[PDB]
Amino acid sequence: VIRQKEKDLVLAARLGKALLERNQDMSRQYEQMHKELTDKLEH
Amino acid sequence: VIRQKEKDLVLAARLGKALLERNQDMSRQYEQMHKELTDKLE
Amino acid sequence: RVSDEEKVRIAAKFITHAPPGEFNEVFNDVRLLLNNDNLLREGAAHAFAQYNMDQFTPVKIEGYEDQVLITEHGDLGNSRFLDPRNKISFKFDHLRKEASDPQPEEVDGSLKSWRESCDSALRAYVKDHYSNGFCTVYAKNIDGQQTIIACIESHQFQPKNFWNGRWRSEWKFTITPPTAQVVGVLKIQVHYYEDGNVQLVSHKDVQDSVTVSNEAQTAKEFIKIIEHAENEYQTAISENYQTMSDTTFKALRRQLPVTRTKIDWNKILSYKIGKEMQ
Amino acid sequence: SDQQLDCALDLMRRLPPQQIEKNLSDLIDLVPSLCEDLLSSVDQPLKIARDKVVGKDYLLCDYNRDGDSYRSPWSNKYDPPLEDGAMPSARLRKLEVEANNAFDQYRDLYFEGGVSSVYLWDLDHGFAGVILIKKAGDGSKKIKGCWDSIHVVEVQEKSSGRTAHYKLTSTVMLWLQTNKSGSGTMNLGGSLTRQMEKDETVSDCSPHIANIGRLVEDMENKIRSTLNEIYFGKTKDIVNGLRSVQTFADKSKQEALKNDLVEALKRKQ
Structure with missing residues (x-):
């Protein structure tokens, strides 16, 4: 179906992008954890 | 019209899923690097 | 838009430059592309005749187990190359890559x-x-x-x-x-x-x-x-x-520079090597 | 017509690397609706432009193809005269002029001549550039060669602390000929492509451009090396495997004793 797959395929893409940003925030905090570990290394 | 949307959007949502694989490898390698950072700290 | 008669020269150009052992693949990538088997049928048929007469194509003779070669220097028109060994005439499908009619050539x-x-x-x-x-x-x-x-x-x-x-x-x-x-x-x-x-x-x-x-x-x-x-x-x-x-x-491109060392990128970027001075 | 595109790419894959430009134009002349779909993954040589105000040279690709003009890094101008192009960052313009400088040094050290160009563009957390290098053979000499290099680099700079993630993709489109008496004419085409990524620490002594310089240097050394030994030796092996110089029945003797020693080695197992 043109319309129904528009709704669900773009929704799967939207949810996939949301999960992308989930892993992005994870990676954001991951590099934050990385710099913290290096700060301790510096000390 | 139909198959254009079907091909482009199934594989486009799966291209975003390719970015999901990318981000998953990012998180994996990040935690491995955290282990190594702690190793150096040790 | 391109006409149909130019497609013959196009397909001829793609067959006459096909590497050995990869003719069939060029044929698949030209059959699934030119979309008209009649145009490439005639034009590419002549191109097949060229590509198989010039590169000394290995043709199998089922009668005497010899696997003779089709050379440009011998023919009688409808793929009727005259096999010198065994004195037999033969037809040959350039695409099927199988000869035909082993008539005993009256050379x-x-x-x-x-x-x-x-x-x-x-x-x-x-x-x-x-x-x-x-x-x-x-x-x-x-x-x-x-x-x-x-x-x-x-x-x-x-x-x-x-x-x-x-x-x-x-x-x-x-x-x-x-x-x-x-x-x-x-x-x-x-x-x-x-x-x-x-x-x-x-x-x-x-x-x-x-x-x-x-x-x-x-x-x-x-x-x-x-x-x-x-x-x-x-x-x-x-x-x-x-x-x-x-x-x-x-x-x-040289393997190593004339100074036989790597590049101190830190040096080039940090300061000019003295190139300004001569 | 997607299968048609797959077979088209395979046709370019098996196409002779002597007439890449002409045959690419021909393949586009088949289905022109698929034209600028192919000019993204079909490797062809470069185009030499001419910066009129500076008196230099600059290569042409899609990254400098601003609209339908080309941003001459020696002047930051567009040719055809498009005063509406996408100028790079002024920050990146300074980084780009020093990039062009460093790669002119690079090019002069390895190529001893030739034309080069380095363009740049952004990224949210970094930037990205391309490195064009085109060395034609010595026109005076009989060696008609044409080295062609394209280096897609993407600097994925991290948060802070000056540590980055340098993603690089390269491509070498070789070309060679010798009119030597022992070989007659020995044409030799060829093309490569690789990828590499490293996370070298950025510093005041180690800027991004220096990291990119080390990566481009290592990459081209690997490609030139890899080519010369693996691929070209493979071709020498193919010519030697086709026809042997030693007379047969002599090779039957050496291969006879070879199989004898094969039995000897696999005899004391």
Whole structure:
């Protein structure tokens, strides 16, 4: 179906992008954890 | 019209899923690097 | 928009440059692309005739187990190349790659003695230096001149190993009895594409002569000139590959700079080396 | 017509690397609706432009193809005269002029001549550039060669602390010929492509451009090396495997004793 797959395929893409940003925030905090570990290394 | 949307959007949502694989490898390698950072700290 | 008659020249251009052992793949990528099998049927059929008459195509003869070669120098129109060995005429489907009609060719008689004589000597030569070689000798009274067009072909079509290669060799044994200026060509095309793409294309315009003294003497002597030029050519090619890291590539790109060290990027970016001063 | 595109790419894959431009134009002349779909993954040589105001040279690709003009890094101008192009960052313009400078040094050290160009563009957390290098053979010499190099680099700079993630994709489109008496004419085409990524620490002594310079240097050394030994030796092996120089029945003797020693080695197992 043109319309129904528009709704669900773009929704799967939207949810996939949301999960992308989930892993992005994870990676954001991951590099934050990385710099913290290096700060301790510096000390 | 139909198959254009079907091909482009199934594989486009799966291209975003390719970015999901990318981000998953990012998180994996990040935690491995955290282990190594702690190793150096040790 | 492009017309239909230009598509014939296009398909001809794509078939006449197809690497050995990869003709069928060019055919698939041109059949699923040109979309009109009638246009490429006629145009590409002539292109198939060219591509299979010039590259000494290995054609199988089911009657005598010889696997003769189709050389440009012998034909009677509808793929009716005259097989010199066994004196049989034959039709051949350029696409099916299967011959047809092994009619016993009533050859007019040109240089049949020379044909099987120099053919025999070349069979010995092929069985000496060619692993999967194939010999074929065309005898013809071309334009009032008796000549032997001995041809040599060897190939390896290994698609699982991502490579090909087809040693092709022609020797116009010009039977100009007082001075057989045996001038021929040994064209080579080698393709390799494992994780990349590399193509070797070469040929040596061999030029040599000898008086047609006798038949057996010039048969094995023809082999003497052949073994000379071929051992010479293969060896020389190998040494051209040997002297390539330092000469040809150094014409293009050196392995290391003339200072024989790496680049201190920190130095170049940090300050100008003194290039402003001379 | 997607299968048609797959077979088209395979046709370019098996196409002779001597007439890449002409045959690419021909393939586009078949289905022109698929034209600028192919000019993204079909490798062809470069185009030399001419900066009129500076008196230099600059190569042409899609990254400098601003609209339908080309941003001459020696002048930061567009040719055709498009005064509406996408100028790079002024920050990146300074980084780009020093990039062009460093790669002119690079090019002069390895290529001893030739034309080069380095363009740049952004990224949210970094930037990205391309490095064009085109070395034609010595026109005076008989070696008609044409080295062609394209280096897609993407600097994925991290948060702070000056540590980055340098993603690089390269391509070399070789070309060679010798009219030597021992070989007649020995044409030699060829093309490569690789990828590499490293996370070298950025510093005041180690800027991004220096990291990129080390990566481009190592990459081209690997490609030139890899080519010369693996691929070209493979072609030499193919010519030697086709026809052997030694007479057969002599090779039967050596292969006979070879199989004898094969039995000897696999005899004391």
